[PDB]
Design a protein around this ligand. Structure first.
Ligand SMILES: O=N[O-]
Ligand SMILES: O=N[O-]
Ligand SMILES: [Cu+2]
Ligand SMILES: [Cu+2]
Ligand code: NI
Length: 309
């Protein structure tokens, strides 16, 4: 339901408030439409996102993503996310999927936003399935209600993003692996959730911690399943010295030409989002690995990584 006269900010008490990030009453025209809109933070000072409540129409919406960045891709009420999400790095905060339980942030854990260094904008992206539901010209206000607090949290949430850049998938080629590997060189993080992302050619995605050549599974998923954040079975600590490794398995069957990494639907991606927390005084909010520093290491990758559901 659209807010109107009350607007998007609800004070929860002296130092907390709910921020409602909603579509400005939109009516799509085709199936598989991707809409985006941004909101600036109401506070300039630092703040912590400690909760997320999904406000989606159970019929219309397929998935929703929420990002933090400093330069949203465009001005304007809303836009097609083909124009982009953010010009700077979009830091994914939250994913809601239809047939997938979003899991809560553990208590005492929050994303750091605002201030001199934190994100100054939220970007919401809403993916609409069919318009068999808005066959009455409904304007839509779906989105996410975010819980913000100025109370510094004992543990800070973050994102370790593994992504391929150089993958090339030859047409009809049965199996192409994209491998990603960096060494972890920060204070300890604890992984509590993961999301995988791939386009139509991805069969399986897997992320491991490697410690003295010992593969410890973080997350393994079919990227053709809803792309939510799934919780980690057993919270996995990654510590200075470990190596994070990831593998996407691809096929080029049904393809006339080669497929590479890129933005469009006819391109591919190999993205594993590892959501972690750290002790506040050690914490950083985002790390990225785009290299493959131990290609020879992948010879001892568990078989599971090569076989799908
Ligand atoms: O961080 N090892 O429990
Ligand atoms: O999912 N399009 O990058
Ligand atoms: Cu979707
Ligand atoms: Cu993509
Ligand atoms: Ni631990």
């Amino acid at each position: 339901e659209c807010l109107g006269t009350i607007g998007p900010v609800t004070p929860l008490d002296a130092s907390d408030f709910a921020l409602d990030i909603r579509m400005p009453g939109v009516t799509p025209k085709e199936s598989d439409t991707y809409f985006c809109m941004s909101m600036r933070l109401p506070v300039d000072e630092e703040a912590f996102v400690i909760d997320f409540k999904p406000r989606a129409s159970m019929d219309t919406v397929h998935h929703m993503l929420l990002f933090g960045c400093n330069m949203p891709s465009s001005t304007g009420s809303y836009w097609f996310c083909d124009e982009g999400t953010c010009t700077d790095k979009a830091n994914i905060l939250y994913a809601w999927a239809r047939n997938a339980p979003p899991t809560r942030l553990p208590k005492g854990v929050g994303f750091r936003v605002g201030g001199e260094t934190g994100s100054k904008y939220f970007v919401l992206q809403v993916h609409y399935g069919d318009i068999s539901a808005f066959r009455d010209n409904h304007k839509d206000c779906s989105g996410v209600s975010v819980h913000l607090t100025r109370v510094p949290q004992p543990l800070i949430a973050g994102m370790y993003l593994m992504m391929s850049v150089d993958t090339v998938i030859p047409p009809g080629e049965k199996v192409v692996n994209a491998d990603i590997s960096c060494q972890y060189k920060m204070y300890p993080m604890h992984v509590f959730a993961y999301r995988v992302h791939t386009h139509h050619l991805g069969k399986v995605v897997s992320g491991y911690r490697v410690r003295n050549g010992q593969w410890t599974l973080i997350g393994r998923q079919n990227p053709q399943l809803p792309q939510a954040f799934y919780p980690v079975e057993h919270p996995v600590d990654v510590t200075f010295g470990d190596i994070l490794a990831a593998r996407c398995v691809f096929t080029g069957e049904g393809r006339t030409e080669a497929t590479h990494i890129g933005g469009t639907s006819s391109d591919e991606m190999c993205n594993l989002y590892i959501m972690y927390y750290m002790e506040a005084k050690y914490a950083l909010s985002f790390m990225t690995c785009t290299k493959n520093v131990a290609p020879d290491m992948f010879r001892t990758i568990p078989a599971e990584a090569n076989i799908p559901i």
